[PDB]
Structure formats: structure tokens, C-alpha cells
């Protein structure tokens, strides 16, 4: 198949900036290049047909270029609506192949996370499983490392993370990490800690607690 290599995978920019995505085919595809926007939970919407034809209703700020192998989408005057994912599609030969997508993030200033640790509830403990939870609240950028530590032993393979989408208002992220033990292993150990590293912290912050303490 004609492989389509889209870049950048992710991209940060500010309202009013002017970004450009690029796709490169491994076979010539003349002007058979298409561009879609996808908001989450929606189906892709076509913006540009073969030969850079703006689709009826696509705003003036969208535009397209390329012939042969190297193709570019270009958005001037990035409005708020335009923060989403974009895909390119070659329609020159079967199978149709898509670029792997570009994700558009609002750029803002660094914000350190607010960190909170939650010991397993007593209701949960009466059923034999312990879930320790670590919340990192409202930080930017997205990159952040959680290190669970159990009596100072760094944990691995012990936890699961999940991250919100960018908040519409403050453009921060929030992270939840869950360390899950059997009630037995839980009670083997005393001090339970959550160590966050993040560009907005001069050094790592730790939240901790003692089992039993509350």
C-alpha cells in the first residue's frame, strides 16, 4: 500500500497561530490527497478533496498544497474550534490509506500539578482489595511521571494511569494513578507514597500516608 507518513503526531499552538501538517506518500499519488478534521466522539469531517478543493463551507483559513509525494495542510488564524485531530487520506489507489493523524493542543504556560494521595477506603478493605489513588490536578504540559513507592520501594507494574482531555477553561490536564494490591500485601507494609515529577516542579513532590494512621 501507499504509506502515508503524517507529522507532527502532536502539536501545540495558540489561538491566532498558523500551523502546517505534512504527509508524505511512499508512491506517487499525483493530486489525490484529502484532509479531514475529527472532533472526539464525532465522525471525521472532510475539509479538502483531491486537488486542494476546499469543501463547500470549510472556512477560508484552511488550505492545502502538494503534488506527487509531499502534501501540506495549512491553517492560518487558528480559531478555538480548530483544536482537534486532522488526518490525511490518499485516494489514488487501493487500499485507501490514512495518515496516522495530528493532534492540536492549546499552548499555555507551565502549571505545576496539585497532588493528593487517597488511602483505600474502609468499605473496600472489607472485601480484600486495596486501591491507593494519586491525583495530579490541573497541570501543563501533559508530561508527568508518577512513581508509587511502598516503604520506600519503588513499584513497577503495579498501577494504572489515566489522563483527562485539556480543560476548555484553563487548558490544564489532570492525572489519576491507581496502585492496586491485595488486602494482604496492603497490610504487609506501612508507608504508601506517590512521587510526582513534572517540568513545573523544581524537584519531585511526594504525598504519603501510614496505613492505619487514618
Amino acid at each position: 500500500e501507499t504509506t502515508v507518513t503524517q507529522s507532527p503526531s502532536f502539536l501545540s499552538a495558540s489561538v491566532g497561530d498558523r500551523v502546517t501538517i505534512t504527509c508524505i506518500t511512499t508512491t506517487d499519488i499525483d493530486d489525490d490527497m484529502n484532509w479531514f478534521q475529527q472532533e472526539p466522539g464525532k465522525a471525521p469531517k472532510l475539509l479538502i478533496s483531491e486537488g486542494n478543493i476546499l469543501r463547500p463551507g470549510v472556512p477560508s483559513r484552511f488550505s492545502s498544497s502538494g503534488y506527487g509525494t509531499d502534501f501540506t495542510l495549512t491553517i492560518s488564524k487558528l480559531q478555538p474550534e480548530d483544536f482537534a485531530t486532522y488526518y490525511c487520506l490518499q485516494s489514488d489507489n487501493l487500499p485507501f490509506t490514512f495518515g496516522q493523524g495530528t493532534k492540536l493542543e492549546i499552548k499555555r504556560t507551565v502549571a505545576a500539578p496539585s497532588v493528593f494521595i487517597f488511602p483505600p477506603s474502609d468499605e473496600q478493605l472489607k472485601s480484600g482489595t486495596a486501591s491507593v489513588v494519586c491525583l495530579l490536578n490541573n497541570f501543563y504540559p501533559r508530561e508527568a511521571k508518577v512513581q508509587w513507592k511502598v516503604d520506600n520501594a519503588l513499584q513497577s507494574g503495579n498501577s494504572q494511569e489515566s489522563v483527562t482531555e485539556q480543560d476548555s477553561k484553563d487548558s490544564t490536564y489532570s492525572l489519576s494513578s491507581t496502585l492496586t494490591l491485595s488486602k494482604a500485601d496492603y497490610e504487609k507494609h506501612k508507608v504508601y507514597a506517590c512521587e510526582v515529577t513534572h517540568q513545573g516542579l523544581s524537584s519531585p513532590v511526594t504525598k504519603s500516608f501510614n496505613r492505619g494512621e487514618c
Partner: protein, 225 residues
Amino acid sequence: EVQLVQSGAEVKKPGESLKISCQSFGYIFIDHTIHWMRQMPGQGLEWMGAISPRHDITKYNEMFRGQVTISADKSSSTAYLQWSSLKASDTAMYFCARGGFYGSTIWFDFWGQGTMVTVSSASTKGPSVFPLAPSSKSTSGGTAALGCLVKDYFPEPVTVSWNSGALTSGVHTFPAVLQSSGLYSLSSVVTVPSSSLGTQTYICNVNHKPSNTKVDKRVEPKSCD
């Protein structure tokens, strides 16, 4: 007006068969082609194949030939996508999209709304809701943090509201994570003032429609030695 209307979400066990559909409104069926796209969770789009109803011609991406069957009923302008034995890795959203014939100039100007297909061992199960109590190690400055751990449910989704919708600022409901069990698990949190904690009551409203489970859980603070 042109609509491509897809069938509703599916939860299946591996090895069952499944047929999802796409009905075309507002244009002449035999004048176009219907295409099927896969989009696995959190990833890009993939072209699976297409059908031209005028000729009964069916084309497949080779990565899907022999795992799925695209068909059509001309009399209802419906296209079908069919599996005879599902695997868990068929878990994804499936879109239909309209296109042209060999040598057309416009592709996928219209899309159905998508059909989510979940394939899993697990059986339907209601969540256990556990408090994430505020304390001193959930006290930033004048900001406290509390929440609910919605654990061990299947399938997705669950909704979470705070104070039957009365509390909305500072709320973060995270994406579920799929456990090795699994059985999804998620958490909803909120940041509130330390002082108010005190005088204000926080209850999370958890709704897991697939299991007809609704639960309300109060999040009371805690005392440390």
C-alpha cells in the same frame, strides 16, 4: 438531505458473530459506493473495504479480507459489515462513509455516526463505588480534593455526577482503565475548599445503565493518629 445512519452499539463475547449496518438516506443508492473504516480505541482510521451496489462489486483491504464480509440490500439502501467469529481485538468504532466509482474526485464527504463494537470475555457487571475521602494529605492550600472510585464494572459506560448535578466546578471524571480482570475502573474527583468540609456534603451519583445499577455515595472526611 443525505444521511448515513448506522446501527447501535454492540457488546459481544469472542467467537460470536456480528453484522452491523449502514442505511443511506437522501440519494440514489446505486449512484455511489459505501466504505467501511475501522478506528480502534485511541488510534487512527483504517480502510477496510467497500461495496458498489450498482455492480455488486466488493473490494477489500487485504488485511481484512477473509475476516469480514461487506454486503448490501439494494431495496433498503443498506450496507452491511459482518464477522462470523469475533476476537477481542475487533473492539473498535466502525464508520461507514460514502464515496464514488473508479476515478472519482470526492471521497468520504458523508459519514455515518459510527458503531462501537466491544468484544470481551467479561459479562455485564455493576460497579462498586468507593469514597476517596478528603483529609490532610488531600489538602493543597485552601484546596481539598475528594472523589469516588467506580470499580469493577462491565461494559462501559458509567456516568458520575456530584450532588445530583448541583456540583460541577472542579470536577474531573477520568477515562476508565481496563483491568486484567477486566472489568473497567474509573475515578471522579473534585477540588473544594478546606474550610467548607466541615459544613458541606458531597455525594457522587453513579449510573451504570447496562447493569441497571445506580448508586449514591457520600464522601465524608477522615481523622489521622
